[PDB]
Amino acid sequence: RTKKQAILETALQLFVSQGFHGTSTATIAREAGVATGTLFHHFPSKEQLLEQLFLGVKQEFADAIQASVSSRGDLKQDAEQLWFAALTWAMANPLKQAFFQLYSMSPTVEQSVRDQAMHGILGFIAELIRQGQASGELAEYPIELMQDNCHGQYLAATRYFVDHPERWQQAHERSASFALFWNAMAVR
Amino acid sequence: RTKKQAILETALQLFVSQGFHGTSTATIAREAGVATGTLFHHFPSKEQLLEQLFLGVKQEFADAIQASVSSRGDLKQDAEQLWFAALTWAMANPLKQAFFQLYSMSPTVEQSVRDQAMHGILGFIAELIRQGQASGELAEYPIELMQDNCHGQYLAATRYFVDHPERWQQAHERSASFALFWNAMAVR
Numbered sequence A, B: 001r002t003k004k005q006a007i008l009e010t011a012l013q014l015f016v017s018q019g020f021h022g023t024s025t026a027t028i029a030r031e032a033g034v035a036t037g038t039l040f041h042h043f044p045s046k047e048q049l050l051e052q053l054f055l056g057v058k059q060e061f062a063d064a065i066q067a068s069v070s071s072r073g074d075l076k077q078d079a080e081q082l083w084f085a086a087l088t089w090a091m092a093n094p095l096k097q098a099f100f101q102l103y104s105m106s107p108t109v110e111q112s113v114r115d116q117a118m119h120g121i122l123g124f125i126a127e128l129i130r131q132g133q134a135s136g137e138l139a140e141y142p143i144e145l146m147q148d149n150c151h152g153q154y155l156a157a158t159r160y161f162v163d164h165p166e167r168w169q170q171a172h173e174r175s176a177s178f179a180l181f182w183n184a185m186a187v188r
């Protein structure tokens, strides 16, 4: 409805179907129904538009998975709720999920912007790992390697369930996905 | 050296720096030093060139990691050698590794071609998982989910070590990366 929102929504569609460098600002503006001048006012470069979109979608994801969890104090239970809320979000938002698969861990997004998403927007993930390490449930590996690992396993499980959508309906497949996630981190 | 190889190497450079849809066949042919006619002889479409490049780099990766293994019959030891050979390859080939980060798990490559790389070129990975399950060393989850998980953990660890190249020189960082990889799969 808003000019800025039409640009962001149109950019999301095009960056997924045609890529970042495969998409021109003229195409974005036209498909959004705005003058090229209006696009550059809100976003001075195509790079800034991608960065704002990236952080925006990351914030939506973080907000959805945290709002789905009401803790009872058990870390493994909360980790399970967060994992299945993340995977549910991925199946419910196929365009935004395809955007993560393409840009979340790619050399395309500036490392500093990927850092803001990792330690800022998803800062609570490292806090849960720290709590699990302190309680003796999680192994003591470098925190940043463990968060990248959570991120890689999420992308692997969502690739799997998008490729085999019938398996997302099978509890044995879902349980196996959490087991791979938890057992990578758990103390041995 | 060969006309076909100059094209594949040029396409690799451009598909990484400018993307697939951001790169034209004219630019590829020009930068490879070949006539557009020669490009289409070897590769009838830009899609076929990406697919042949993709399978080619996957075959090089598979060949390098398998050639670096001195197996003694211990699965965990062989998995450790394969994991560190894969990460060594990623650090040694920054362009081809960036190509995997961008295309290996992305919706850009045809699912059929991603399947040929997964079950054909890297078919030995599934065989090692089956052997580990039969020996009581690896958990019994669906093998395709486990293989996607191996793939996601590799991309996460190589993202980490490319972002922090000084940590790749630290044995405790390296050991922690294998621990996350092995413990995801191992029986509990």
Ligand SMILES: [Cl-]
Binding pocket: A092, A093, A094, A095, A096, A097
């Ligand atoms: Cl969506």
Ligand SMILES: [Cl-]
Binding pocket: B092, B093, B094, B095, B096, B097
């Ligand atoms: Cl390279």
